[PDB]
Write a protein that binds this ligand. Structure first.
Ligand code: NAP
Ligand code: 10H
Length: 306
């Protein structure tokens, strides 16, 4: 295992467990798989208000602390502020609600989930995200979140926060879709220049949910270059996709609700890719965001406009 030092001095483990499962998966499965993830060695656990699982994920964490397997300070838990709660007066209550659902005193990381503000209390809203970010800074000062960051921001959106007059805490990270078909090189370079960690979701090619993903889109884990690399290293396409991210300096999430795959994914630390391997993977980039829906693409702050 290892950690990256965030720009506020806290540490984030480089491999994260993805906890989202679509609604057909019974809620209690999150409890079970989160416990297995922790048994396999995951210490970074990624959730959100949106994922409707914070109560099960928090209960997994508390159970593994309660039985001596881990201490609270060995777990890095992320939640996220949903886009109906961008108005500043809504931010701390949203974080408090997440904390109550998970039964934790603090989150290691709290993210603005998306720049795409939605109308509260119920379609887009226009919110000054610099005001949302001030509200986020307040949550760090209160000890509700050790660190704060963003998700789904593009470069212009991130700059807007970084250039805020009176900025107190830079975002520690930008959690974004990132994988060999959509590798975000230029955004990564920008993030690296500002000491903001890029965190990759859908690093294994997404769950291909029919609500948002084109089933015609290429299946990342069937890619022939990943398959060739998997054979060369005697690993699996998933492990090649994860290892790629680690060697680019990207913190990588990995969702699995399968016991065997959960245990396999921690092997990312057991091997290395060469410069030539990495070049071959870099050759797959093709501007493919799996999340590609009419329900998002017209939003005035849709990030894939730039
Ligand atoms: N910030 C945001 O807007 C945002 C958006 C999307 C996701 N996320 C976060 O990112 C996490 C991960 O992304 P994601 O949900 O798109 O899924 P992902 O990590 O890309 O995984 C996709 C599929 O890979 C399969 N898989 C996992 N390990 C494998 C292995 N070793 N070999 C073969 N298949 C494997 C899993 O199926 P099985 O369960 O059957 O193993 C999984 O459904 C989410 O759970 C959530 O925590 C955040
Ligand atoms: C998918 C859209 C368009 C691309 C940027 C991000 N978003 S979003 O912020 O509207 C968003 C983020 C996450 C989700 N989501 C829904 C269930 C799992 C999941 O991550 C849905 C929409």
């Amino acid at each position: 295992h290892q950690c990256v030092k965030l720009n506020d001095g806290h540490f984030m483990p480089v491999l994260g467990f993805g906890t989202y499962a679509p609604p057909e998966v019974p809620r209690s499965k999150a409890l079970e798989v989160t416990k297995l993830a922790i048994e396999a060695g995951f210490r970074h656990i990624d959730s959100a208000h949106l994922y409707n699982n914070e109560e099960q994920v928090g209960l997994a964490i508390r159970s593994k602390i309660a039985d001596g397997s881990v201490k609270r300070e060995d777990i890095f838990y992320t939640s996220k502020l949903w886009s109906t709660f961008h108005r500043p007066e809504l931010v701390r209550p949203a974080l408090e609600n997440s904390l109550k659902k998970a039964q934790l005193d603090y989150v290691d990381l709290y993210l603005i989930h998306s720049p795409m503000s939605l109308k509260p209390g119920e379609i887009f809203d226009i919110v000054d995200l610099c005001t949302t970010w001030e509200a986020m800074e307040k949550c760090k000062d209160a000890g509700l979140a050790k660190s704060i960051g963003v998700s789904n921001f593009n470069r212009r959106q991130l700059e807007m926060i970084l250039n805020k007059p009176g900025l107190k805490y830079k975002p520690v990270c930008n959690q974004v879709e990132c994988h060999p078909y959509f590798n975000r090189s230029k955004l990564l370079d920008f993030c690296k220049s500002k000491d903001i960690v890029l965190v990759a979701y859908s690093a294994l090619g997404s769950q291909r949910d029919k609500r948002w993903v084109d089933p015609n889109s290429p299946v990342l884990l069937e890619d022939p270059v990943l398959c060739a690399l998997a054979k060369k290293h005697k690993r699996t396409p998933a492990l090649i996709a994860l290892r790629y991210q680690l060697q680019r300096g990207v913190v990588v999430l990995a969702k699995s609700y399968n016991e065997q795959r959960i245990r396999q994914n921690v092997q990312v630390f057991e091997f290395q890719l060469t410069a030539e391997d990495m070049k071959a993977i870099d050759g797959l980039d093709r501007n493919l965001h799996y999340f590609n829906s009419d329900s998002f693409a017209s939003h005035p702050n849709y990030p894939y406009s730039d």
